[PDB]
Write a protein that binds this ligand. Structure first.
Ligand code: CDM
Ligand code: ADP
Ligand code: MG
Length: 282
């Protein structure tokens, strides 16, 4: 049996620059990982099956991104003779990231399964191939597949590795579930933010174009943001509902957490420019 990290990510900033006709939004964002997330364990099968043994709450087996990732890799490899006969796996996950919470846990789960099973089945697919397969599963899957903090354009797949400061974060989950489509279809969502350079973006104040909508429509996001902004710079990540505050040291971040009311649903973790997954792969 093998164990594989599946880390969370933050959008240190997130700007919506436009929208293409397929419905998706063009953006400029800065991904960083957290040294914190799910653990996925794999045991190879020889009967060619794929079984997710640990269900994820509210997700059907065949709807689970873990299974979809594994089956997508199995089909691609077999279509091109890269799948040893009988390849399969029993997969289990210890999920720490709230489902749909905003940290991209499902996105990260798919990436880890692609990278791990590519290694275990000895499919030999390249990073570009894996990341290309990941993109069909989710716009956030490629960053996790490629394993480094990155400036992202396109829908999230045009990735330029960068090395942001690995600050400490208090990550809080408001008590509400924000479906990603709700934010992205909101008429008031900024979709005209001017496309700028990484040097302009690295100097300008970091913000999240989705925040004004999240905080306005979901009072529990506004409550959590208001509490944290009294202590440190705080922003929405992804489309929410998750919110994080930035700190320079573990002690400060943990002191604010010790004070935080339970409805923050908070934890503290350090940013990591190298994905714990790719770190464990070395
Ligand atoms: C907002 C971010 O979290 C920033 O990292 C990502 O761009 C979202 O990507 P994601 O979590 O993988 O969500 P997906 O499963 O890929 O897409 C869900 C839906 O969100 C909307 N969506 C997502 C990404 C994007 N660049 N433009 C969009 O309009 C689409 O309606 C899509 O049907
Ligand atoms: N392994 C998984 N973990 C979490 N969610 C999953 C998984 N597989 C499928 N999903 C589904 O996809 C969504 C999870 O999105 P996720 O990336 O966790 O959201 P966010 O990016 O807001 O954190 C939910 O609709 C859930 O039903
Ligand atoms: Mg997502």
């Amino acid at each position: 049996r093998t164990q594989w990290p599946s880390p969370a990510k933050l959008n240190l900033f997130l700007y919506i620059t436009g929208q293409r006709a397929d419905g998706y939004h063009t953006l400029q964002t800065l991904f960083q990982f957290l040294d914190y997330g799910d653990t996925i364990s794999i045991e190879l099968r020889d009967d060619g099956d794929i079984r997710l043994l640990t269900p994820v709450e509210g997700v059907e087996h065949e709807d689970n991104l873990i299974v979809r990732a594994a089956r997508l890799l199995m089909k691609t490899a077999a279509d091109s003779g890269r799948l040893p006969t009988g390849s399969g796996a029993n997969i289990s996950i210890d999920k720490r990231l709230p489902v749909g919470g905003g940290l991209g846990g499902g996105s990260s789960n798919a990436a880890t399964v692609l990278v791990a099973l590519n290694h275990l089945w000895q499919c030999g697919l390249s990073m570009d191939e894996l990341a290309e397969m990941g993109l069909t599963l989710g716009a956030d899957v490629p960053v996790f597949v490629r394993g480094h903090a990155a400036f992202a354009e396109g829908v999230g797949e045009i990735l330029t590795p960068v090395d942001p400061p690995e600050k400490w974060y208090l990550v809080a989950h408001p008590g509400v579930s924000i479906p990603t489509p709700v934010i992205f279809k909101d008429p008031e969502l900024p979709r005209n933010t001017p496309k700028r350079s990484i040097e302009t973006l690295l100097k300008c104040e970091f913000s999240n174009d989705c925040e004004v909508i999240a905080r306005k429509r979901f009072r529990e996001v506004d409550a959590v943001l208001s509490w944290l902004l009294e202590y440190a710079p705080s922003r929405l990540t992804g489309t929410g509902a998750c919110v994080f505050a930035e700190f320079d040291t573990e002690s400060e971040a943990r002191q604010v957490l010790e004070q935080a009311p339970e409805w923050l649903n908070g934890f503290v973790a350090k940013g990591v420019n190298l994905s714990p997954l790719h770190r464990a792969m070395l």
